[PDB]
Design a protein around this ligand. Sequence first.
Ligand SMILES: C=CC/C1=C2/N[C@@](C)([C@@H]3N=C([C@H](C)C4=C(CCC(=O)O)C(C)(C)C(=N4)/C=C4N=C1[C@@](C)(CC(=O)O)[C@@H]\4CCC(=O)O)[C@](C)(CCC(=O)O)[C@H]3CC(=O)O)[C@@](C)(CC(=O)O)[C@@H]2CCC(=O)O
Ligand SMILES: C=CC/C1=C2/N[C@@](C)([C@@H]3N=C([C@H](C)C4=C(CCC(=O)O)C(C)(C)C(=N4)/C=C4N=C1[C@@](C)(CC(=O)O)[C@@H]\4CCC(=O)O)[C@](C)(CCC(=O)O)[C@H]3CC(=O)O)[C@@](C)(CC(=O)O)[C@@H]2CCC(=O)O
Lengths: 208, 208
Amino acid sequence: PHEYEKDGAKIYVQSFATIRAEADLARFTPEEEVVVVRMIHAAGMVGLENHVRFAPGMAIAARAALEAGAPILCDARMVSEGIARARLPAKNEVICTLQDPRVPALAQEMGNTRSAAALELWRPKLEGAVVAIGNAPTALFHLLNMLEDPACPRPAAIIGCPVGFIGAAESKAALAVANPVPWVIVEGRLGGSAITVAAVNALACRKE
Amino acid sequence: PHEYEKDGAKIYVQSFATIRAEADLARFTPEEEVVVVRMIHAAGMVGLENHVRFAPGMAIAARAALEAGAPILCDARMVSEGIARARLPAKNEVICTLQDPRVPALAQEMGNTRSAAALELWRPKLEGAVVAIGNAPTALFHLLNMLEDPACPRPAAIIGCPVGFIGAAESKAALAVANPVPWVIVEGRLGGSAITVAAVNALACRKE
Ligand SMILES: C=CC/C1=C2/N[C@@](C)([C@@H]3N=C([C@H](C)C4=C(CCC(=O)O)C(C)(C)C(=N4)/C=C4N=C1[C@@](C)(CC(=O)O)[C@@H]\4CCC(=O)O)[C@](C)(CCC(=O)O)[C@H]3CC(=O)O)[C@@](C)(CC(=O)O)[C@@H]2CCC(=O)O
Ligand SMILES: C=CC/C1=C2/N[C@@](C)([C@@H]3N=C([C@H](C)C4=C(CCC(=O)O)C(C)(C)C(=N4)/C=C4N=C1[C@@](C)(CC(=O)O)[C@@H]\4CCC(=O)O)[C@](C)(CCC(=O)O)[C@H]3CC(=O)O)[C@@](C)(CC(=O)O)[C@@H]2CCC(=O)O
């Protein structure tokens, strides 16, 4: 038959070692470097690290908020499903409101996407949250506008990594310019649910 | 506030137009070209098309099996959750057995990963299925070995797009050399749940 490596704990260690032998990671602090390594792993793409940007302190702040029990608010089900329940340090809730039966009618009334309208339902869980946006640029731009009101609850951190051709690059450059709360992004068109998940999973647990 | 495009049906049309203006797509048949466009969209990466390979007839065969009610067997929950229930043409079942409570003990006894052991549970749904492997190279290599037995039920098609540094490229090159059933792959390290989902969603419905 076909022969191949079957020890997944070994596969992980090997993957990480290969990435650290090939990637240009010197500019990242130790807390940032672990996140980057996992994002590269998820993407299968050495070179990705030339596009990542963090606010000073973000990685430290996000791991603290998770260790304190913060929820994780996700734009898409592909993000919520990816988060490793085993790695969570404090029984953290993982939330996506996209399929709430109220979202189609709210989106029509707002003249916005479903991805964006569903963020309105995050309000009660937003104070101190870790935000994970892996898909929808409209969700990230709508979140920026939400946070321009001083009465809106404010998250602990935002992982802003939407992907794509229309809106994506612009929404991530606007996040970084606005600097509402500590943030990380993948500049340009690259991003997506896998990279976003990998960032959350890296931040959640001190072990790789 | 921040200004940005809010019509998602418009966003899609624009995304696709941008990809078709930039990407090198001439070698693909019309049925293949639609799949490729959606995979690029999901990845945010023009250039991806230089890595995609299809068996002759795969795209036609996979869309037929779906129109006939075939299930969709998925390695990972990030794949199963991504598939658009609205685009499915014939009430198709979407299945992932990874979290079955029998999988941890079966994997120990097989000396294999959970991703791989969970494929044993696909047997009753495998005849005529569309296989969507977006994550685990071990699952794809284990599937090849499964199919070396003439008694194993055989799928209609395989979308083989695992990602990563260890095993991934090798498992996809082995799929293509073995040619068990019609197939598509992303050669090398790139791949993942988003690209895989996008292939299934492109095949499921004739409208873009
Ligand atoms: C349609 C199914 C999945 C999907 C969705 N994507 C949706 C978020 C829709 N996808 C959207 C757009 C086309 C989208 C992208 C935007 C930028 C660009 O187009 O170049 C990018 C970000 C390039 C993009 N769509 C990418 C993707 N969309 C996809 C994928 C799988 C491609 C595809 O096959 O159509 C792929 C996944 C990217 C990732 O996880 O890394 C909608 C229309 C607007 C969101 C926005 O631009 O901010 C959105 C629907 C809505 O919110 O009203 C989803 C809810 C649709 C559904 O269930 O019918 C839905 C949510 C999936 C989830 O919850 O896992
Ligand atoms: C740990 C959580 C998610 C995850 C998983 N990935 C797993 C599949 C584990 N991931 C695995 C490996 C490290 C893996 C990769 C293989 C190649 C390489 O490492 O370079 C690649 C393919 C590079 C890889 N892992 C990539 C990814 N794994 C991930 C991600 C999100 C990265 C991360 O944060 O660890 C990312 C997603 C890629 C995508 O969707 O496009 C295990 C250990 C082996 C599978 C194999 O190599 O064939 C696997 C566990 C097992 O089957 O025994 C998961 C079941 C673990 C869990 O729940 O504890 C689990 C399944 C996720 C799902 O059902 O959505």
